[PDB]
Structures are given as C-alpha cells and as structure tokens.
Design a protein around this motif. Structure first.
Motif, short mmCIF file in Angstrom:
data_model
loop_
_atom_site.label_atom_id
_atom_site.label_comp_id
_atom_site.label_asym_id
_atom_site.label_seq_id
_atom_site.Cartn_x
_atom_site.Cartn_y
_atom_site.Cartn_z
N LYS A 94 4.12 15.71 12.43
CA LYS A 94 4.16 14.68 12.98
C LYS A 94 4.02 13.47 11.94
O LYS A 94 4.72 12.41 12.20
N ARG A 95 2.90 13.44 11.35
CA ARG A 95 2.55 12.41 10.20
C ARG A 95 3.97 12.12 9.45
O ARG A 95 4.01 10.88 9.16
N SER A 96 4.31 13.16 8.95
CA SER A 96 5.29 12.84 7.96
C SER A 96 6.74 12.35 8.49
O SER A 96 7.21 11.37 8.18
N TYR A 97 7.03 12.74 9.75
CA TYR A 97 8.01 12.12 10.61
C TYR A 97 7.74 10.62 10.70
O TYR A 97 8.51 9.89 10.79
N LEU A 98 6.37 10.24 11.33
CA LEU A 98 6.00 9.15 11.63
C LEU A 98 6.19 7.97 10.29
O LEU A 98 6.63 7.01 10.48
N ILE A 99 5.65 8.55 9.21
CA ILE A 99 5.91 7.82 8.30
C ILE A 99 7.50 7.31 7.66
O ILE A 99 7.65 6.52 7.43
N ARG A 100 8.32 8.66 7.74
CA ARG A 100 9.71 8.40 7.58
C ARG A 100 10.18 7.35 8.82
O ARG A 100 11.05 6.31 8.43
N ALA A 101 9.61 7.22 9.68
CA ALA A 101 10.48 6.49 10.83
C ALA A 101 9.80 4.73 10.60
O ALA A 101 10.69 4.03 11.24
N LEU A 102 8.83 4.60 10.02
CA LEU A 102 8.34 3.31 9.73
C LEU A 102 8.89 2.60 8.34
O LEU A 102 8.00 1.67 7.92
N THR A 103 9.58 3.47 7.62
CA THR A 103 9.81 3.25 6.30
C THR A 103 11.06 2.37 5.96
O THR A 103 12.07 2.57 6.87
N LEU A 104 11.13 1.31 5.16
CA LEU A 104 12.24 0.64 4.81
C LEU A 104 12.43 0.62 3.15
O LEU A 104 11.55 0.52 2.41
N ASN A 105 13.74 0.82 2.97
CA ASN A 105 14.00 0.96 1.42
C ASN A 105 13.98 -0.15 0.83
O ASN A 105 14.26 -1.27 1.44
N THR A 106 13.93 -0.19 -0.68
CA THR A 106 13.98 -1.51 -1.41
C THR A 106 14.83 -1.23 -2.36
O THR A 106 15.00 -0.28 -3.05
N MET A 107 15.36 -2.48 -2.98
CA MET A 107 16.18 -2.39 -4.25
C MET A 107 16.29 -3.81 -5.00
O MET A 107 15.38 -4.48 -4.18
N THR A 108 17.13 -3.99 -5.76
CA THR A 108 17.18 -5.32 -6.42
C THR A 108 18.35 -5.93 -6.11
O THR A 108 19.47 -5.50 -5.92
N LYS A 109 18.36 -7.11 -5.86
CA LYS A 109 19.61 -8.03 -5.39
C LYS A 109 20.41 -8.48 -6.66
O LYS A 109 19.86 -8.73 -7.52
N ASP A 110 21.68 -8.39 -6.65
CA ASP A 110 22.72 -8.60 -7.78
C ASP A 110 23.52 -9.71 -7.27
O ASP A 110 23.61 -10.12 -6.27
N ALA A 111 23.82 -10.58 -8.51
CA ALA A 111 24.84 -11.75 -8.37
C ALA A 111 24.17 -12.81 -7.55
O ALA A 111 24.73 -13.08 -6.11
N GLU A 112 22.98 -13.42 -7.67
CA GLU A 112 22.69 -14.52 -7.04
C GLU A 112 22.40 -15.83 -8.05
O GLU A 112 22.03 -15.87 -9.23
N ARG A 113 22.92 -16.81 -7.42
CA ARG A 113 23.09 -18.17 -8.24
C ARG A 113 21.82 -18.78 -8.30
O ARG A 113 21.15 -18.87 -7.21
N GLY A 114 21.38 -19.67 -9.18
CA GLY A 114 20.44 -20.43 -9.40
C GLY A 114 19.04 -19.92 -9.70
O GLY A 114 17.98 -20.74 -9.28
N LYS A 115 18.96 -18.66 -9.86
CA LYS A 115 17.61 -18.01 -10.17
C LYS A 115 17.69 -17.44 -11.52
O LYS A 115 18.62 -16.58 -11.94
N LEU A 116 16.52 -17.76 -12.08
CA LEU A 116 16.35 -17.16 -13.60
C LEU A 116 15.94 -15.65 -13.62
O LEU A 116 16.37 -14.79 -14.10
N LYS A 117 14.96 -15.42 -12.64
CA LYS A 117 14.35 -13.96 -12.52
C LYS A 117 14.79 -13.40 -11.15
O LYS A 117 15.13 -13.85 -10.19
N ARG A 118 15.02 -12.06 -11.25
CA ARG A 118 15.05 -11.12 -10.07
C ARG A 118 14.26 -11.04 -9.09
O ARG A 118 13.07 -11.48 -9.15
#
Ligand code: MG
Lengths: 732, 51
Positions: free
Chosen positions: A196-220
């Motif tokens: 139950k707890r493993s599935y509950l953790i999976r259900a409330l999870t959002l993946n994360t990554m880095t954005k590419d090709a953004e103008r006007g920003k020095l840092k990612r």
RNA sequence: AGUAGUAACAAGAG
RNA sequence: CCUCUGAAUAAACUAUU
RNA sequence: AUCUAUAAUAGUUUUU
C-alpha cells in the motif's frame, strides 16, 4: 571610428527599437548532463523558504512534511512562505464582494464541465510519468497502461467513459492493500506486487528534469512532469480557475495575442480615465521572486473551499482532492550523476536511488552539501516536497490570488486617499497607483508590498521598477503609450518547418503574411524574406531550378522533368519550377496559384490518387477520387505530401515489442472504421465493446438493406450466420 | 585544387607560433597529409564528391 | 587536445 | 570481426487544417 | 449587433 550600435538609442527610443535587444539569431542554451543537482537545489531552497514552519510525519507515507501556514510574520525582505490563512480568506471574500455572483456562476459552469468531461481528455499532452514504469511515457500510453492495471486489479468504473469515474477508480485504488503490475526485461513478462505505501508513494510522485532551449537565462533550471493519478483533479481545478478568470478585468489569462493586447490597452486606458486630473499616477513593472516555491497547496485548498461554499458535497470533494494530493507530493531526483577516473581513464553512471547511502567522498563541496541537506527528506528514491507548487501548475488559480490582492486596492478597502489597480498574469504584474502626492504613492506601494507579503507573495525588488504612468512592460509586451511591435521574438519561426515540401512552402508563405499583418513587417522586407525562404527551401529539399547546374542526387530527375515539360511556370518549386509568389498572392496555396499553368500529363501525375507516397482508403476497393492522407498547412494533398521515417531507438530496448501492440491496435481500429464511417471525422462515444458494437451494426445494416431491397436473402442469411459465429467466438 | 594551383610561392612549412597545450608536429603532419592527398586525388583522373 | 560550462561529449549497446 | 541506433516537460495563446 | 465549437501539428510567453 569605433562602431557602437547601442548609441543608436540616443535618438531612437528603446521601445521603438526593442527588437535590437533580442539576440535570437544564435542557438539557445542547452542542458548537457543530469538534472539531479537542480532538483536537489529546488527542494532545498523550497524548504529553506519555509524553515520556520511545523515539521510533521505523514502517517500514510511516512515522509517528513513542512507546514509554513500561519507561521511567524517576516521581519525582513527575504522571500518567505508564511501565508496567513485568515488573510487569504479575507482576500477571497472581498473579491466576491466586489464581483457578486462570480463564484456561484463559476461553480455552475464547472459542475457542468465536470459532469460532461470524458476520460479521453487525459490523452492530451506530450508526456506523462507512468507509475507502472517509473519514467515518462506518451500520455495515451500511460493512460492505457493505468487502465489495464486497474482492470487487472478489479477497478473498472472507468468503463463508463467519464473522467470522474476514472477519479473514483484512482480513489478506490488508493485503498487497495496491494497492487499487481507487469514488467519487461531481456522481452519476457514478470509480475510485481506493490504494497500500500509503495503504491501510494508512486501515485503522489512527479518526475523532474532540466529545461532546454530557454532564452534570456544564464543558468539552467528544473521542470516537473505530473503523474497519471493527479492529472484529472488538476484539470477540474484549472477549469474552475479559468471560469473565474474569464470574469475579471485585471486578469491577463486566458487571453493572448491581439485579443490580450486589446484587453490590456482597454483596461489601462479605463484606469487612466478613472484617475482624477489632480493626483499623481505611477506604474510599477513588477516581478515576483520564486513565485511557485512560496505558494502553498494548503492555501489553494482554502481558496477552493471558500469558492465552493453552498455547493453539493461531491463537487467540493472532487475539487478538493487536487490540493490534498499536491501537499503530499514527492519529487523524483533524476538520472543521478556520473563519476570519472583520470588515472584509470574510465567513466560510470551513479543512479539517484543510491544517493541515500552513498559515500560522500566522490562529490565536490557543493553537491556534498546538497546531498547532506536533502538526505533527511529522501524516501523510496524520491524526496519529500510538501510546500510549494512545483513548476508551471495552477497558473490560473495563482492568477486569481494575484487579482484578489489587486482588487484589495480600491478606496472602499484602502480607506485612504491612495488606491491601486492593475494587470495580473500568473506571477507577472503591472500596478497602477494613484495618490494626491508622492508620499501617497510611497504609502500605497508599501501597503501593496506588505499585503502581498501576508499572502505569501514576494515582490522582486531587483527586477521591479516604477515610473510615471504611460510606459511599462507586461508579459514581454512593451507598452509605450500603446503596445509596440517586436519582430525578433517571432523571428525563429522564419525558415523551413520540416513537415514536408508542401506543408513547408505553405508555412513559410503564411508566416511571412502573418508577420506583415501583425509585427509591422514591411513590403520590401517581406519580399526579401520570401527570397530567403525560397533559397533555404531549395537548399533543404534539393529542389533547385531545373535550368541550373547544381550537383545533387536529385538534379538528374529534375532536369529530365524540366526538359520534358512545355509550361515551366506550372511546375512547383519542389519540381524545380520558378517562384510566382509576391505580396499580393501570399494567401493562396502554391498548387492552386499555378493550377492554370500545368500541363495535363504533369498535372495528372502530380494529383494522382494512386501514388504510394500517400495512403489509400478501402471503401469499395480504393477511393480513387483525390489524394487523401492531419492536413495542417497542407490544403491540397499531392505527391509532395510524403511522410518521413521514424526514430528507431526503441528497437534496441525491451519496449520494442510495444511497437507490435500499437500496430495491432491500428489493425483493429481500421476494421472499426468499416462499420462506423463517422468515427474518423468525429470521436465515437459508447460503453459497449468494439466487437459487440460492430456485430450490432452489421445486423441492423443487413436488416435495413434487406428491407429496402439492396441485398438478396442469401446474403442476409449468410451475414446472420457469420454474426452468430462471432457471438460463439466471443464466449470462447 | 584549381584555387591552390593559382598561387605560387609555397615554402617548406614551419611552426611560427606554437600551441601551448598541443603537439605542434601533429599539426604540421596534418598539413603535409592534406597536401599529399590533394595531389593523390589529382592523380587519379577523377575527382570524387567526397574524399 | 578540443567543444563546452555548475555536466556532459570526446560513440553506445548487444 | 560482425549486427542494430543516432533521442517526445506543464498551462495559455498564435497559425493552418 | 453578438461570436471561448471541437481534435492534430508546429511556434511564442511564463531566472534565488
Ligand atoms: Mg514582470
């Protein structure tokens, strides 16, 4: 004489030449490696903005959670997330007071939307974090896998076809003691059981990554992708927020383009007219620092609770689920890191699931500090992130909150000689403040700043500025007594789209025309843009004029076609023909433009329905009427509407078998189109299985044809016999 | 090849400004190899699209 | 070496 | 040695169909 | 006089 382009601003106002300040002719910055560092930094910074809150342990997931609501009032100007619940409720109450009936009508419209929406709405989007695979999958694929797992676990309310029934399925799955899913490897199928707890953790999870090709920003920076369970609730909440925002003048959403510019100009001029002729008026171009890391889901829950008063309980529950799920959210760390050994000259990948108990001798000082700070929050390969809105979510509800703070600026609420109004769009804002003298302006600005502080909104001091009313900037629109044109922003759209020859030609000419209409692109520059586009098109598609000697693999065929043709002007540019476009005929398709110049044989070969570069239908034998393929920017389909190949990476993975599956799906779908012709044109809706619907349609069609005399009784008997055979097969 | 032939005055290449972090003899050998292979393709009574 | 810049490439897998 | 492969965040809007 | 119909594709805007 040293050339200094910037000195041009000494004579041309900056707005009137603002396009010169956008270096959008070079490639934009990209992210190279992992995004784990940015995700850890975001989590740590979000918790730092709320450090003085209350720490608790979640009884269902066990993850530590930080609650800054009703926290200490700030004593300085640093960003803080200690929003006061009473202040948020009061802002909502006064917004309701100023616009009577707004929440009631919004709730009525949203109730209709909730009761009508179908589950297929979730197939929209690009990617989705699939909890059954711990990674991103196409939205339709993720939905299909989730439905399959739910059916395997006895959760079949989604068969109704309504989104709300799918949400009921999600809620019921939350209570399952165990879940069972299937996994692929080196391409066998194995079963995995999640408690139950493993599935509950999976259900409330959002993946994360880095954005590419953004103008006007020095840092990612980092971006997030939600899971399957939370998409529907967020959709309903955002529908409610959209309904609310449609009824507010200060809202900059959900309008855009020319309509948005017109609305902003009308609102600004109305504010100017309402201003007295004997009082100072100032405008603040402002930004809010770390908007999404300081807004809390609990305050959104409070706002929704206040908005949905005197409404049916089911509506309130279905709306309230989303903030509940978002205040118990988890964050995936990312790919991990990579380590290098110079002496041995080797490299290795360290996954993010090992960061919990990995020795810290490998990492540098900054990463070591990140990991040390974030370790207490790590559970089951993710990080506990209770406070904050992750990235680009609840934009319209944030707009509602900002507009409520703006609405608090009326004289009936300030109870003094100064007042304010303005424009809000998610987290960007322009504020017009009117007061009899400068001290009044200062007092109004200070009161606005502190009231924003009370609701957890921090005005960026280093990115915000104030001047006399008449010029400002809002959502990248530069207003100087009226919005000014900015050509450089749309400049990257010029070029070759990369769909196919016909679509690319249409897109190029249409882009030139639209920029003439909208961005003040002049006639001569339009002609030069046409010339440049034709040059790029010819070089990309190897379709130079047949009367040239450019060496390409395609030049021989084009030369033969050019020599055998009598009317040259009738040839398309894709066939080595000339360019007939000018200003007056940018709105006409190329094939239609030179239809009355094509040779009969060439015209027939070009528009031949039996060309293998475009598929064929199956009605009767083949619909041999027009070239038929999704026809965006392609008015008339010809042999130049071909389709390019597909990426073949999956062939080296364990998911390659999925290819087969999708192919098979297409097969079945094709058959369904032989019974219900309108399915392609309009999306069919029903609860019966595909086979049952097809058999019923076959029976009714046979009866109708036999009654009307279209078929003989032998065919009717045979069709009925085959239908009975299919019924027998259905059980076996 | 045609443009190379139009210039007269080739000398024996020598390093005037070295690359501090590199191996300059490799650059010299690269230039010599380019010249040799240009002559080679010029001697095969047919110039291909790519070399 | 070089590209590049808060992390990677300088081929990967079977 | 040989075989295969060259990489799809959210919301809103704009354009075309 | 009013004018948010759907779905596909691409482009733009939304940093301690
Ligand atoms: Mg701003």
């Amino acid at each position: 004489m040293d050339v200094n382009p910037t000195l041009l601003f000494l004579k041309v106002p900056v707005q009137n030449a603002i396009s010169t300040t956008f270096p959008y002719t070079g490639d934009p910055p990209y992210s190279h490696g992992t995004g784990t560092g940015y995700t850890m930094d975001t989590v740590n910074r979000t918790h730092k903005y709320s450090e003085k809150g209350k720490w608790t342990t979640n009884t269902e997931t066990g993850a530590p959670q930080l609650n800054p609501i009703d926290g200490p009032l700030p004593e300085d100007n640093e960003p803080s997330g200690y929003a006061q619940t009473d202040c948020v409720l009061e802002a909502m109450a006064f917004l309701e007071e100023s616009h009577p009936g707004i929440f009631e009508n919004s709730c009525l419209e949203t109730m209709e939307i909730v009761q009508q929406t179908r589950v297929d709405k979730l197939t929209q989007g690009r990617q989705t974090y699939d909890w059954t695979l711990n990674r991103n999958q196409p939205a339709a694929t993720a939905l299909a896998n989730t439905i399959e797992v739910f059916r395997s676990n006895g959760l079949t309310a989604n068969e109704s076809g309504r989104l709300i029934d799918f949400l009921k399925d999600v809620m019921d799955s939350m209570d399952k003691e165990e879940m069972e899913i299937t996994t692929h490897f080196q391409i066998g199928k194995k079963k995995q059981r999640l408690n139950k707890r493993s599935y509950l953790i999976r259900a409330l999870t959002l993946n994360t990554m880095t954005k590419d090709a953004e103008r006007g920003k020095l840092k990612r920076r980092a971006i997030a992708t939600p899971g399957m369970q939370i998409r529907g609730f967020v959709y309903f909440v955002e529908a409610l927020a959209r309904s609310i925002c449609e009824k507010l003048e200060q809202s900059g959403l959900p309008v855009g383009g020319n309509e948005k510019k017109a609305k902003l100009a009308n609102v600004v001029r109305k504010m100017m007219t309402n201003s007295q002729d004997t009082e100072l008026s100032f405008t603040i171009t402002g930004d809010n620092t770390k908007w999404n890391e300081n807004q809390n889901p609990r305050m959104f829950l409070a706002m929704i609770t206040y908005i949905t008063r005197n409404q049916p309980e089911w509506f309130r529950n279905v709306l309230s689920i989303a903030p509940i799920m978002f205040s118990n959210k988890m964050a995936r760390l990312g790919k991990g890191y990579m380590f290098e050994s110079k002496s041995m000259k080797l490299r290795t990948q360290v996954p993010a699931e090992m960061l919990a108990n990995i020795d810290l001798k490998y990492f540098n000082k900054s990463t070591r500090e990140k990991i040390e700070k974030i370790r207490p929050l790590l559970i089951d390969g993710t990080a506990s992130l209770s406070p904050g809105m992750m990235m680009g979510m609840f934009n319209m509800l944030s707009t509602v909150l900002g507009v409520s703070i703006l609405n608090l600026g009326q004289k009936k609420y300030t109870k003094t000689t100064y007042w304010w109004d303005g424009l809000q769009s998610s987290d960007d804002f322009a504020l017009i403040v009117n007061a009899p003298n400068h001290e009044g302006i200062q007092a109004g600005v200070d009161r606005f700043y502190r009231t924003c502080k009370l609701v957890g909104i921090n005005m960026s001091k280093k990115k915000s500025y104030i001047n006399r009313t008449g010029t400002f900037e809002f959502t990248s629109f530069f207003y100087r007594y009226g919005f000014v044109a900015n050509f450089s922003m749309e400049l990257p759209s010029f070029g070759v789209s990369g769909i196919n020859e016909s679509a690319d030609m249409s897109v190029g000419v249409t882009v030139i025309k639209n920029n003439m209409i909208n961005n003040d692109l002049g006639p001569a520059t339009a002609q030069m843009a046409l010339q440049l586009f034709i040059k790029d098109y010819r070089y990309t598609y190897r379709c130079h004029r047949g009367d040239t000697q450019i060496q390409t693999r395609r030049a021989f065929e084009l030369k033969k076609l050019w020599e055998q043709t009598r009317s040259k002007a009738g040839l398309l540019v894709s066939d080595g023909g000339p360019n007939l476009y000018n200003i007056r005929n940018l709105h006409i398709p190329e094939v239609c433009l030179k239809w009355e110049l094509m040779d009969e044989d060439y015209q027939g070969r070009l528009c031949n329905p039996m060309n293998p570069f475009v598929s064929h239908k199956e009605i009767d034998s083949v619909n041999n009427a027009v070239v038929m393929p999704s026809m965006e920017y392609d008015a008339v389909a010809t042999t130049h509407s071909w389709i390019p190949k597909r990426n073949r990476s999956i062939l080296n993975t364990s998911q390659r078998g999925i290819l087969e599956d999708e192919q098979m799906y297409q097969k079945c779908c094709n058959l369904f189109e032989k019974f219900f012709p309108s399915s392609s044109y309009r999306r069919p809706v029903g609860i019966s299985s595909m086979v049952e619907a097809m058999v019923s349609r076959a029976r009714i069609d046979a009866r109708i044809d036999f009654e009307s005399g279209r078929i003989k009784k032998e065919e009717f008997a045979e069709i009925m016999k085959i239908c009975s055979t299919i019924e027998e097969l259905r059980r076996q | 090849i045609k443009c190379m032939k139009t210039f007269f005055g080739w000398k024996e290449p020598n390093i005037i400004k070295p690359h501090e972090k590199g191996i300059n003899p490799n650059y010299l050998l690269t230039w010599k190899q380019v010249l040799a292979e240009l002559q080679d393709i010029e001697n095969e009574e047919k110039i291909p699209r790519t070399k």
